[PDB]
């Protein structure tokens, strides 16, 4: 029985290395994550792999891993595929944990944009939680933290992470990490997956697919949402994406609004991530 190594980036930047079947489904590999993890709630997690085109995808679950890495490297992430909108109402602290260390990422890439005053915040909550109470000893007037709080750091940003860490003494990592998710949990792009897009008549948006639902971000002054109870149906073909909007009460005819995709394959990847989500938070 033919078995294949696989890598995984976890979220502590570390990599976890195992062996599957080279015929078995992403479940299986997403089994072995979970456990080595001590991940109960998984449902809100997934592995993704870099296509051929170098684009992040989700590893189904349902099927085969050789007929979604295809020609490359059996190479994974291990991240959040649902960020919960209620981060308090999870079971487990370990759940919380690991949504706090993707929510790290997701503010140092500057996927998730932040105001100076709300990184020094979650600065100080990830230091309470990962070196405890502060302690003058390890901050001088120079104090720089190996912890990447932020897409540019500054010292004013570090001074002000300090500060903010004085008033936690007593708070445990639980505890910080709960404070870290109810701030982050508000800012406008919590959870929001953005794909480029052009519009009917050829303008540039982009779509960010949600727990709430589906936003077109058209112009600044401009920004559409549709509730997912609004969407009545979701479909590709070729390089564009449809979305068919309810009829408002009294109306005739739901209303159809088209996107143009850059290709055929990230068309196909909005169709999965909208249809997922839509279950998802239809259940939630
Ligand atoms: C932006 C926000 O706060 N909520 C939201 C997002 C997408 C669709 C409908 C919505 O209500």
């Given at each position: 029985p033919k078995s294949m190594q696989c890598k995984v980036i976890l979220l502590d930047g570390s990599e976890y290395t195992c062996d599957v079947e080279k015929?078995?489904?992403?479940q299986v590999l997403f089994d072995k994550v979970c456990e080595h993890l001590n991940?109960?709630?998984?449902?809100?997690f997934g592995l993704t792999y870099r296509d051929a085109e170098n684009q992040k995808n989700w590893?189904?679950?349902?099927?085969?891993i050789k007929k979604q890495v295809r020609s490359g490297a059996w190479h994974f992430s291990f991240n959040v595929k649902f960020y919960p909108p209620?981060?308090?109402?999870?079971?487990e602290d370990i759940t919380r944990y690991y949504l706090c260390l993707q929510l790290r990422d997701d503010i140092v890439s500057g996927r998730l944009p932040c105001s100076f005053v709300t990184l020094a915040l979650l600065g100080s909550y990830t230091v309470q939680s990962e070196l405890g109470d502060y302690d003058p000893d390890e901050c001088g007037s120079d104090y720089i933290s190996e912890?990447?709080?932020?897409?540019n750091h500054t010292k004013e940003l570090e001074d002000k992470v300090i500060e903010l860490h004085?008033?936690?003494?007593?708070?445990t990592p639980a505890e910080a990490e709960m404070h870290f998710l109810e701030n982050a949990?508000?800012?406008?792009?919590?959870?929001v997956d953005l794909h480029h897009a052009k519009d009917s008549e050829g303008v540039e948006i982009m779509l960010g697919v949600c727990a709430s639902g589906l936003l077109i971000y058209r112009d600044r002054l401009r920004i559409n949402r549709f509730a997912w109870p609004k969407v009545l149906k979701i479909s590709y073909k070729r390089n564009n994406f449809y979305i068919k909007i309810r009829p408002g009460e009294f109306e005739q005819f739901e209303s159809t609004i088209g996107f143009k995709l850059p290709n055929h394959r990230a068309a196909k990847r909005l169709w999965k991530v909208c249809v997922e989500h839509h279950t998802f938070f239809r259940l939630l």
């Amino acid at each position: 029985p033919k078995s294949m190594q696989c890598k995984v980036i976890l979220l502590d930047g570390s990599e976890y290395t195992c062996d599957v079947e080279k015929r078995s489904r992403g479940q299986v590999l997403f089994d072995k994550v979970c456990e080595h993890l001590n991940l109960l709630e998984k449902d809100y997690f997934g592995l993704t792999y870099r296509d051929a085109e170098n684009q992040k995808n989700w590893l189904d679950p349902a099927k085969e891993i050789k007929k979604q890495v295809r020609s490359g490297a059996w190479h994974f992430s291990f991240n959040v595929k649902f960020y919960p909108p209620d981060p308090a109402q999870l079971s487990e602290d370990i759940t919380r944990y690991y949504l706090c260390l993707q929510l790290r990422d997701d503010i140092v890439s500057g996927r998730l944009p932040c105001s100076f005053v709300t990184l020094a915040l979650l600065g100080s909550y990830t230091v309470q939680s990962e070196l405890g109470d502060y302690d003058p000893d390890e901050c001088g007037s120079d104090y720089i933290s190996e912890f990447r709080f932020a897409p540019n750091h500054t010292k004013e940003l570090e001074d002000k992470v300090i500060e903010l860490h004085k008033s936690h003494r007593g708070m445990t990592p639980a505890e910080a990490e709960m404070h870290f998710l109810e701030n982050a949990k508000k800012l406008s792009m919590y959870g929001v997956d953005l794909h480029h897009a052009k519009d009917s008549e050829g303008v540039e948006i982009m779509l960010g697919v949600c727990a709430s639902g589906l936003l077109i971000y058209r112009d600044r002054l401009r920004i559409n949402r549709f509730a997912w109870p609004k969407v009545l149906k979701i479909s590709y073909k070729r390089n564009n994406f449809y979305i068919k909007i309810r009829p408002g009460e009294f109306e005739q005819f739901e209303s159809t609004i088209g996107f143009k995709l850059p290709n055929h394959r990230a068309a196909k990847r909005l169709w999965k991530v909208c249809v997922e989500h839509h279950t998802f938070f239809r259940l939630l």
